[PDB]
Amino acid sequence: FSPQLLSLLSLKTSLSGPPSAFQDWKVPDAVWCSWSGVVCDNVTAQVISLDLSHRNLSGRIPIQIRYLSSLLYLNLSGNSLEGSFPTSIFDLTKLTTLDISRNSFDSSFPPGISKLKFLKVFNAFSNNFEGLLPSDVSRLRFLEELNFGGSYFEGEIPAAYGGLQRLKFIHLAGNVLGGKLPPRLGLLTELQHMEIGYNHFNGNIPSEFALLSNLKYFDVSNCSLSGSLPQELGNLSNLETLFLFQNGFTGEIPESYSNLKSLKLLDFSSNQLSGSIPSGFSTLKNLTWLSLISNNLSGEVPEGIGELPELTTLFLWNNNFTGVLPHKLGSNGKLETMDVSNNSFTGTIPSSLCHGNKLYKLILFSNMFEGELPKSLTRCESLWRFRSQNNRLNGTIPIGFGSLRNLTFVDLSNNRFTDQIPADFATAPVLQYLNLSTNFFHRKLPENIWKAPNLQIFSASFSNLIGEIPNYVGCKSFYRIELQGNSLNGTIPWDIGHCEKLLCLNLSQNHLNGIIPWEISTLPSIADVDLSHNLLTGTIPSDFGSSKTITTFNVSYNQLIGPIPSGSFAHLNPSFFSSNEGLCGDLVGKPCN
Amino acid sequence: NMEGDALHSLRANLVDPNNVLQSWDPTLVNPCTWFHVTCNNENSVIRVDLGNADLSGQLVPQLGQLKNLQYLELYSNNITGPVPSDLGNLTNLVSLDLYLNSFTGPIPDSLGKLFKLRFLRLNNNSLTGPIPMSLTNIMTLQVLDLSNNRLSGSVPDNGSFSLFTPISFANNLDLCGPVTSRPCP
């Protein structure tokens, strides 16, 4: 029968795969053209397209190929098969398209590749290749898309490559490739997409790169490239993506960049960039993601960023920045996530951040922010993660937080917040973390407090608290509680044995009195307990020594009296019980009886 | 956030039918905002408390890379598999509680390398093999419970093991010693 048939059959049998893969290929005249994955040219019966991928198919690739001569398409993807790449495939030659991606091929890349020549698309992405990039591929003039990434390719990027006039798309990303990026690259005029990152390059970005007009996607990230950001780059007017993040770039960000009006995503993160942000950055109305994270960046943030109709992700964190946040910020209503933390930012939080209720992650922390906390912020449905710690935020805390079905993480610690703690706080259904510590409150906890449906960590420590500690009513999810350093009086609740999951409880430096409830002897996982510096008087509970989980009990500086438990308590530190003048036992030194 | 990647390795190898690990988010700047993880003021992990999480499956040796890890509490779970010798790679570890699980295999001699160690509880597991002598070089050791296992061997009475009553080593396969009931060769 036909060489097409000998070919397809030999291909069937030479590739070891689950029989599900080749299920329809058996032969009884032009039969093979029916088969699954096969497409034939309706006049000639010759197999012009072969797609077999994600077939879980491994093996050797037959030498009885090139028997289907007019074949324009070959796709084999994800199938794990390793080898030196077959040089046999280069002798196909009517191929316009070849995808060998996501497979295991290794060692070097065989030289004969230029023999294809009418070739448009080559995808080698995600394989085990080592060795220098084949220089040879540089000679297919018509090559449009080339993906060599996802391998380990040694050596530099052949400058020869700049000569594929028709090349649209180039992916060398995630290899071992190195050195200076060859300037000749600015000569692919038709070039749209360039992703070369995750290899190791040094030097600058070649000024000559400003010559690619049609360029859209440019990602050089996770390399060693350095020096200044070239002014000239401000001239690629078609550019929708620029990722320069994690490199050695220095000096100010050139004002010229205010010129990419098509720019959408910009990520400069983990560089040395210095000086202020271009006043002209206010002008990119196609801008969606803006990330300056972790640089030397300075000066105020341009007021003009207040309205970019499209702004979504804003990351300014880890610089030294100054002044107000742009005050109409968030009013574009599409704002999702903002992190400005670790800066010198001052002033008031924008009232309109959530004006569109699309915002979820808000990190304002470690800043100079002053003034009250936007009431509007309790109106944000989407709010899930919010961390405001280490600021000057003042006055009473806004009262609407318990509404939100999505809100799981809140840190208000170290601020100037005064007055009451919001009551609805423990009514909010998902809230898993709450830190109100180190504030100016001068009021007391809610009755609601221990009722929190899923709430694991809670810290009110060192904010000017006063009053009785509300009885724990169905303590559910709590593992860590810090109430220490306050003016709280009254007694430790009868029902505290309700928190089964409780681990570390720091109650110290307070005005507490009465006794220490036996119920704690029965907390099943309990680890750390710090009760020191109080008016507590009573006995240390009988059965406590029977617990395999307590490593810490600090009852020091109290009125306690009576014997200390022989138990786990034997392994304890004497200085835990010191300045309790009424205790007897071994660890206090004075015997009973 | 190296240790973040490590904790996440553990997570990934882990079966978490109730999603406690669900807060463990590899893309976070470090795992100090994770639940069940506790870090210091230097932002390195000193604690991992997963006790009673209904976790199944196993552990990865990546747990070694937490250099400042002090308390590792995995007790009362369905965790099975072996015990990684790379736990010897944890120096500042004060407490190791693996007890109440399905763990199999030897007790790693590398465990003899933890000199800040105070509490060691492997009890109520499936462990086999002998009791490594290097364990006796930890003089900070206070509570050792090896009880309820498959352990074969002879029990050390020297070093820290001076202080240990039989309730520590009770109910095993052949185990011989003066720390126990039945002597040996």
Binding site: N127, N222, F243, D267, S269, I293, R387 | -
Partner: peptide, 12 residues
């Protein structure tokens, strides 16, 4: 071998 792609993710 698979390779990262996109904007830098790291977060707080």
């Amino acid at each position: 071998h698979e390779v990262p792609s996109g904007p830098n993710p790291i977060s707080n």
